[PDB]
Amino acid sequence: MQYNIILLVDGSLSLEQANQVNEKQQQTLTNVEGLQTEYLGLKELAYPIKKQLSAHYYRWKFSGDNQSTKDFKRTANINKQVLRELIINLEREYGYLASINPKKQQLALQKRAKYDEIIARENNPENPDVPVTSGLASTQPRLSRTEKAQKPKEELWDVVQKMGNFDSVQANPYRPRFKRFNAE
Amino acid sequence: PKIEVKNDDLELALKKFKRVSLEIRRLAQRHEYHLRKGMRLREKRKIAQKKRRKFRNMV
Amino acid sequence: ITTTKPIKAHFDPVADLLTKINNARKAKLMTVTTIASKLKIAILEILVKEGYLANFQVLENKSKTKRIVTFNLKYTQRRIPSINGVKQISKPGLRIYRPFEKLPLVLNGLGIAIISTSDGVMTDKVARLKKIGGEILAYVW
Amino acid sequence: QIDKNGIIKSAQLHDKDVGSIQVQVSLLTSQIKQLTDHLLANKKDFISKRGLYAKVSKRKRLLKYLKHNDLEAYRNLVKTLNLRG
Amino acid sequence: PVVALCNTNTNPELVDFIIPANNHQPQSTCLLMNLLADAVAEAKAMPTMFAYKPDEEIQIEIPQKKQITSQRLNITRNPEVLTRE
Amino acid sequence: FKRSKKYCRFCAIGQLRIDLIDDLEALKRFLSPYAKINPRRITGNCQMHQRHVAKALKRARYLALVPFVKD
RNA sequence: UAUUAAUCUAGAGUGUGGUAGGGAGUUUUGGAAUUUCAUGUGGAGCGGUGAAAUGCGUAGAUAUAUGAAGGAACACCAGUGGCGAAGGCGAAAACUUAGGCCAUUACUGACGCUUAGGCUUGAAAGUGUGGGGAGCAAAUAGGAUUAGAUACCCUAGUAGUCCACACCGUAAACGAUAGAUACUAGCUGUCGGGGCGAUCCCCUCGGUAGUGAAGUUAACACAUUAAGUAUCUCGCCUGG
RNA sequence: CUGCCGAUAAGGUCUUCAAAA
Ligand SMILES: [Mg+2]
Ligand SMILES: [Mg+2]
Ligand SMILES: [Mg+2]
Ligand SMILES: [Mg+2]
Ligand SMILES: [Mg+2]
Ligand SMILES: [Mg+2]
Ligand SMILES: [Mg+2]
Ligand SMILES: [Mg+2]
Ligand SMILES: [Mg+2]
Ligand SMILES: [Mg+2]
Ligand SMILES: [Zn+2]
């Protein structure tokens, strides 16, 4: 799998914290792939936890077997320098198969390009953008669909026997009953 | 539910605070009397239907 | 002839056709399709001889592995059918076998009774003429 | 999860025969083996019990079928898989 | 006998001499209504108005109060029948 | 008066994925002034996304990134 | 039709490729809120009701601010919604795991439907052993009301509600509608997969709703998710 | 804007009819 830890180390001193993250990394993770690490920075988190108001957020983008979690998880709490820890397995988040699917990635790029074009015209440099068309409906249908529309599998069948056919065609329904008025 | 007075006028603060208190009073009164889980679900669906039907004709 | 829809049929072969005919009559539909079987093919041949349906064409696939019969009903000019009511006798489970002396007459001969004695499906009058009886498929009037 | 690819390749009578009865029973036995472990560990998951019972019953009916038709292959299949007992 | 200008939302059984036509356009209606009146006037031996006539004499105007809009809207005036309890 | 501009952004953008350290400032708009996940009428997202953002936002509120009851 | 000897894939399954889920169990984690206790400020009521009275309070209550401990349930999201065969499932994460939808130039080649007996699951209450107990509250005590009140109201309050392992197997366990299969106008929503590519909207294949004709019904009403036209199988009914 | 608020002996008529004007 591909996991993603977001570690919360205390707010002491930068250089010494990085060592704490490195120590916490090299101890656990029995079997592991490449361990890329980041550093989101220093933020004043919303609710105070462990009576601390500043914390260093680290992100790990390793990958490996399911056993890489147990030892690291049980040591995090014990370590007084770590406030929280979340192992978000990106193979189970709300949408992962589509993200690996190649066609959807290219379509998303195209949507980014086109959507950026619309927002630009609206927030025109200074000239008035009369259409202000964003939330409103679009124009006529997309001619792309009209053509590239799928064709159902019309299974072709060959006639073998017949009988009585004459295709009379009696498509004259709801015909007039009354015909010509008359007097007794 | 902090709302600043802006020190420009007083009424306006109470004009916004009335709304905030009404939605606040709804949940405060909900967790006052014990209903069964089925009845609690029943009351949630009842509120949603009332709000929905009213919004249909206001839209 | 080409199609677009998948064709399914019931496992019981007499009432499958019977349901198709009855539903089309009630809903005023004319052209229906179903899977083709030799018992089903033979009963449709005698029906068109008796003048209850207009045309009956059996077709096969391009591979010769499947056949589906697509029949149409015989509506008059004012759009009221020739079939009035259908009822199946030898249903699955309880198979009806009647000798010649007890061959039924449906609506005093107005309707037709389908009897497959020994030479395929056969009308009641000709069954009486040969003085031989057997399996009774369905009542059509 | 079980490595479905390896077990199917072992049970193939010939290539591309990925939908016979023999490949089905080899896969079913593997799922049964895995599910008995899981259910014995937990003992309170009853939907897994539902899956285990359904898979056992499905395997039994198919083997009955393979006895009714081509009984000789039934003897061959039973000695390799050791599923009877 | 009853004749009518059905407009796609009518039961064809009730009418006898159905005349497929519009019913929402103040121009189509008048053209067709005068046409039936025109038959009556010729039978009564008074001169026709629109029937058996060339282009210049059939010309009619669109009443007041791009193209004309024969769209049916005002759907918001159809809520759910008052219910709930 | 009101507006009809309520349309799921991630659909027009085809974002297809929500991660709490890729669009954090985007998720703060969905939250209420009193740190609450605004409903459909305010947030504007399709229910499917409305579910995805809620799980991610509650995850951030577990990760101690956004408050609970105050500003 | 039944038996036997064989062929075929359309029924049903398997694999590959897309894919949506509060589906389940096990182990950890989190914040509000209530209660109790600890420490400050404070000074006469608080509490409760139709109205009051038991009750709590100068031993400093209610209130306010901080902290600690502990148990239970998971606001908003949350729905003219999703999943499961049903009961049911809604804080976050990990592991294990069940079924389902769509497209299949692939494969087996009738292996399918139902199911007496049997097995599995099965809301809440209840039982047995050992833990746990913040809140609430059968039984119980008191104050009210009342002609009387063993009840509705109020103040206390044990079992219980919680966990682990063993049982009990009943509910308006309801869609008061057994399962499977084929056919029969239409319109409006909404959800998922697929096709196009800003959304929005169009088409296809399915799930979940509303309206509605033929058709059915004693009527109410059902109406493509049937209570309609038919077949198979099981269960059940025969006046109070 | 939610005080309080209980009971009521037995058996019984009444549609004769449309043949019709
Ligand atoms: Mg047959
Ligand atoms: Mg505290
Ligand atoms: Mg219980
Ligand atoms: Mg007492
Ligand atoms: Mg109390
Ligand atoms: Mg007890
Ligand atoms: Mg019962
Ligand atoms: Mg209805
Ligand atoms: Mg009796
Ligand atoms: Mg009184
Ligand atoms: Zn969306």
GROMACS .gro file of C-alpha atoms (C1' of nucleotides) in nm, chain G residues 7-177:
model
  171
  632U      C1'    1  -2.377  -3.084  -2.957
  633C      C1'    2  -2.483  -2.485  -2.869
  634U      C1'    3  -2.488  -2.032  -2.557
  635A      C1'    4  -2.917  -1.705  -2.462
  636G      C1'    5  -3.020  -1.895  -1.822
  637A      C1'    6  -2.679  -1.904  -1.423
  638G      C1'    7  -2.165  -1.875  -1.255
  639U      C1'    8  -1.594  -1.773  -1.315
  640G      C1'    9  -1.177  -1.428  -1.484
  641U      C1'   10  -0.998  -0.976  -1.674
  642G      C1'   11  -1.133  -0.419  -1.678
  643G      C1'   12  -1.413  -0.002  -1.470
  644U      C1'   13  -1.671   0.121  -0.942
  645A      C1'   14  -2.009   0.322  -0.541
  646G      C1'   15  -2.095   0.251  -0.059
  647G      C1'   16  -2.287   0.468   0.817
  648G      C1'   17  -2.188  -0.369   0.511
  649A      C1'   18  -1.933  -0.650   0.971
  650G      C1'   19  -1.584  -0.778   1.347
  651U      C1'   20  -1.112  -0.680   1.634
  652U      C1'   21  -0.758  -0.309   1.831
  653U      C1'   22  -0.640   0.207   1.929
  654U      C1'   23  -0.751   0.761   1.931
  655G      C1'   24  -1.050   1.264   1.988
  656G      C1'   25  -1.373   1.705   2.145
  657A      C1'   26  -1.795   1.927   2.345
  658A      C1'   27  -2.179   1.838   2.743
  659U      C1'   28  -2.356   1.634   3.235
  660U      C1'   29  -2.196   1.474   3.733
  661U      C1'   30  -1.839   1.459   4.137
  662C      C1'   31  -1.402   1.652   4.357
  663A      C1'   32  -0.991   2.039   4.415
  664U      C1'   33  -0.875   2.594   4.408
  665G      C1'   34  -1.027   3.123   4.369
  666U      C1'   35  -1.435   3.553   4.339
  667G      C1'   36  -1.899   3.614   4.564
  668G      C1'   37  -2.313   3.691   4.927
  669A      C1'   38  -2.910   3.469   5.011
  670G      C1'   39  -3.156   3.214   4.792
  671C      C1'   40  -3.154   2.800   4.446
  672G      C1'   41  -3.475   2.433   4.269
  673G      C1'   42  -3.953   2.295   4.102
  674U      C1'   43  -4.496   2.402   3.923
  675G      C1'   44  -5.118   2.505   3.643
  676A      C1'   45  -5.016   2.694   4.165
  677A      C1'   46  -4.704   2.501   4.516
  678A      C1'   47  -4.466   2.183   4.857
  679U      C1'   48  -4.087   1.792   4.972
  680G      C1'   49  -3.550   1.903   4.843
  681C      C1'   50  -3.067   2.182   4.827
  682G      C1'   51  -2.846   2.654   5.086
  683U      C1'   52  -2.451   3.125   5.606
  684A      C1'   53  -2.114   2.398   5.703
  685G      C1'   54  -2.132   2.989   5.169
  686A      C1'   55  -2.568   2.702   4.759
  687U      C1'   56  -2.714   2.885   4.233
  688A      C1'   57  -2.358   3.156   3.937
  689U      C1'   58  -1.855   3.261   3.742
  690A      C1'   59  -1.303   3.108   3.608
  691U      C1'   60  -0.925   2.704   3.591
  692G      C1'   61  -0.787   2.198   3.665
  693A      C1'   62  -0.840   1.668   3.759
  694A      C1'   63  -1.115   1.191   3.744
  695G      C1'   64  -1.480   0.883   3.527
  696G      C1'   65  -1.875   0.668   3.239
  697A      C1'   66  -2.231   0.692   2.830
  698A      C1'   67  -2.365   0.863   2.335
  699C      C1'   68  -2.129   1.028   1.879
  700A      C1'   69  -2.418   1.782   1.739
  701C      C1'   70  -2.340   2.035   1.239
  702C      C1'   71  -2.247   1.703   0.775
  703A      C1'   72  -2.782   1.458   0.756
  704G      C1'   73  -3.092   1.443   0.261
  705U      C1'   74  -3.841   1.527  -0.167
  706G      C1'   75  -3.040   1.028   0.049
  707G      C1'   76  -2.661   0.530   0.063
  708C      C1'   77  -2.558   0.018   0.210
  709G      C1'   78  -2.730  -0.505   0.405
  710A      C1'   79  -3.148  -1.096   0.316
  711A      C1'   80  -3.383  -0.915   0.764
  712G      C1'   81  -3.277  -0.711   1.261
  713G      C1'   82  -2.958  -0.279   1.163
  714C      C1'   83  -2.561   0.052   1.026
  715G      C1'   84  -2.367   0.810   1.118
  716A      C1'   85  -1.681   1.127   1.567
  717A      C1'   86  -1.135   0.958   1.331
  718A      C1'   87  -0.782   0.582   1.209
  719A      C1'   88  -0.552   0.079   1.121
  720C      C1'   89  -0.621  -0.474   1.018
  721U      C1'   90  -0.941  -0.861   0.859
  722U      C1'   91  -1.368  -0.929   0.560
  723A      C1'   92  -1.906  -0.976   0.288
  724G      C1'   93  -2.213  -0.864  -0.102
  725G      C1'   94  -2.351  -0.547  -0.512
  726C      C1'   95  -2.372  -0.221  -1.018
  727C      C1'   96  -2.155  -0.141  -1.557
  728A      C1'   97  -1.878  -0.323  -2.011
  729U      C1'   98  -1.703  -0.781  -2.162
  730U      C1'   99  -1.427  -1.020  -2.944
  731A      C1'  100  -1.262  -1.468  -2.266
  732C      C1'  101  -1.413  -1.958  -2.022
  733U      C1'  102  -1.718  -2.368  -1.837
  734G      C1'  103  -2.177  -2.552  -2.117
  735A      C1'  104  -2.829  -2.594  -1.796
  736C      C1'  105  -2.413  -2.650  -1.347
  737G      C1'  106  -3.090  -2.299  -1.277
  738C      C1'  107  -3.600  -2.147  -0.932
  739U      C1'  108  -3.837  -2.299  -0.488
  740U      C1'  109  -3.764  -2.568  -0.046
  741A      C1'  110  -4.086  -3.013   0.406
  742G      C1'  111  -3.683  -3.173   0.767
  743G      C1'  112  -3.192  -2.937   0.913
  744C      C1'  113  -2.839  -2.521   1.004
  745U      C1'  114  -2.720  -1.970   1.062
  746U      C1'  115  -2.863  -1.483   1.199
  747G      C1'  116  -3.236  -1.233   1.465
  748A      C1'  117  -3.479  -0.493   1.788
  749A      C1'  118  -3.575  -0.415   2.298
  750A      C1'  119  -3.690  -0.637   2.761
  751G      C1'  120  -3.512  -1.082   3.071
  752U      C1'  121  -3.126  -1.468   3.275
  753G      C1'  122  -2.598  -1.671   3.475
  754U      C1'  123  -2.085  -1.556   3.603
  755G      C1'  124  -1.705  -1.136   3.644
  756G      C1'  125  -1.614  -0.599   3.569
  757G      C1'  126  -1.825  -0.099   3.519
  758G      C1'  127  -2.154   0.280   3.678
  759A      C1'  128  -2.145   0.992   3.465
  760G      C1'  129  -2.657   1.064   3.315
  761C      C1'  130  -3.144   0.843   3.327
  762A      C1'  131  -3.499   0.555   3.540
  763A      C1'  132  -3.910   0.006   3.620
  764A      C1'  133  -3.968  -0.142   4.167
  765U      C1'  134  -3.962   0.197   4.630
  766A      C1'  135  -4.000   0.660   4.969
  767G      C1'  136  -4.192   1.151   5.020
  768G      C1'  137  -4.458   1.622   4.846
  769A      C1'  138  -4.877   1.766   4.539
  770U      C1'  139  -5.361   1.702   4.270
  771U      C1'  140  -5.796   1.434   4.386
  772A      C1'  141  -6.439   1.240   4.640
  773G      C1'  142  -6.021   0.830   4.639
  774A      C1'  143  -5.476   0.834   4.330
  775U      C1'  144  -5.123   0.215   4.446
  776A      C1'  145  -5.143   0.721   3.807
  777C      C1'  146  -5.055   1.192   3.491
  778C      C1'  147  -4.674   1.667   3.786
  779C      C1'  148  -4.223   1.737   4.123
  780U      C1'  149  -3.782   1.575   4.464
  781A      C1'  150  -3.498   1.157   4.565
  782G      C1'  151  -3.407   0.640   4.396
  783U      C1'  152  -3.212   0.005   4.336
  784A      C1'  153  -3.222  -0.354   3.943
  785G      C1'  154  -3.135  -0.212   3.450
  786U      C1'  155  -2.942   0.074   3.051
  787C      C1'  156  -2.254  -0.021   2.931
  788C      C1'  157  -1.832  -0.420   2.838
  789A      C1'  158  -1.647  -0.977   2.790
  790C      C1'  159  -1.823  -1.475   2.772
  791A      C1'  160  -2.274  -1.788   2.796
  792C      C1'  161  -2.828  -1.829   2.714
  793C      C1'  162  -3.365  -1.660   2.593
  794G      C1'  163  -3.557  -1.651   2.002
  795U      C1'  164  -4.019  -1.321   2.091
  796A      C1'  165  -4.216  -0.743   1.835
  797A      C1'  166  -4.733  -0.319   1.449
  798A      C1'  167  -3.969  -0.826   1.335
  799C      C1'  168  -4.484  -0.367   0.845
  800G      C1'  169  -4.421  -0.229   0.216
  801A      C1'  170  -4.963  -0.539   0.739
  802U      C1'  171  -4.779  -0.714  -0.004
   0.00000   0.00000   0.00000
